[PDB]
Design a binder for this molecule. Structure first.
Ligand SMILES: Cc1cn([C@H]2C[C@H](O)[C@@H](CO)O2)c(=O)[nH]c1=O
Ligand SMILES: Cc1cn([C@H]2C[C@H](O)[C@@H](CO)O2)c(=O)[nH]c1=O
Lengths: 192, 197
């Protein structure tokens, strides 16, 4: 009896690299609140963890905060994935899968997450996928280019994620590809 | 609603400070495993996490390892609390409460866990209490003075915790007291208090 069983409608997962136009995209539903369950990335919760900004800390010193920060992202992704709703359609920005398969994995490859820290996160993920139901019917992949994405970031009045190397976006891009492209229903869209 | 709700039998939690004689006490229950679910503290998992020994790392470098270590402790403890069993009684050594009210709290106070790390652990504990079901019908508290606890750890083979300052056991002791005696925490069950003597 996985927490949040028969209480989740058709769920759409909006995926994409950093600066792939996920925010602008989901805004089209901003006027469908009255009919659909629209859940944007819990970025605000990550900026206000009872006073601490884990998002800002992780970028200013990964090797020290990637672990706690990623552990919190997971929890917020879980709360959304299992949150109760009356609507018959749920649209989520990002998900527990991308945080795991892309962001955590990336941080392991580039050294931000040491062995013990990564393992701890993986153990939590394994338990979750065995004792919790994650409704993921459709996946909307906003495929982009590391370069294009890098530009869209530099353009906006960014804050925390503004100082990210192009290489970071390249490694992230590849992970999304390996997961959403090179092996459920995934609808790729040319987000350019 | 709550996960594991209605699948847990009467559950007894054994609690005490480090070196309170809990491993020895629990041994006496081994000859009853036939009708009892005896879950000892998952120390084996903390020493071997896909090859890594978090317990050792935490004790050698609190500032850096307390966070990932306590996180995994929460998890393994959550696994024990919700594990399936056909027995009519379950005895667990330590719990998700002792990890929260004693161990994590003390690591926040002495600086081992920085505010952002403490809050993350706290958030998981809050989400868990709101969802996951945690059976607790009784707690057997092996009360021991820090002096006696320290002496007991001293007379045993050298482990990772063998180095804890008396001040440390003293801090954990008051935290177990505030929880199981003064009831300053919002615990969920009766408490039977035994003496080490
Ligand atoms: C989903 C997720 C986003 N992020 C980053 C990407 C951005 O800078 C921001 C939200 O888009 O946080 C992570 O660091 N880890 C994650 O698991
Ligand atoms: C349950 C728990 C035990 N421990 C320590 C006490 C011992 O050295 C060992 C198991 O009793 O691990 C913690 O540091 N934190 C915890 O949350």
């Amino acid at each position: 009896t996985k927490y949040a069983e028969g209480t989740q409608p058709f769920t759409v997962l909006i995926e994409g690299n950093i600066g792939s136009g996920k925010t602008t995209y989901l805004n089209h539903f901003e006027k469908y609140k009255n009919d659909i369950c629209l859940l944007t990335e819990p970025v605000e919760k990550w900026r206000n963890v009872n006073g601490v900004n884990l998002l800002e800390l992780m970028y200013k010193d990964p090797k020290k905060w990637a672990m706690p920060f990623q552990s919190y992202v997971t929890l917020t992704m879980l709360q959304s994935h299992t949150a109760p709703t009356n609507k018959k359609l749920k649209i989520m920005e990002r998900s527990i899968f991308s945080a795991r398969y892309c962001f955590v994995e990336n941080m392991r490859r580039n050294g931000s997450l040491e062995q013990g820290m990564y393992n701890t996160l993986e153990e939590w993920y394994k338990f979750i996928e065995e004792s919790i139901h994650v409704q993921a019917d459709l996946i909307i992949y906003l495929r982009t280019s590391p370069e294009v994405a890098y530009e869209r970031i530099r353009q906006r009045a960014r804050s925390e994620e503004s100082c990210v190397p192009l290489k970071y976006l390249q490694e992230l891009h590849e992970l999304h590809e390996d997961w959403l492209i090179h092996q459920c229903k995934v609808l790729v869209l040319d987000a350019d």
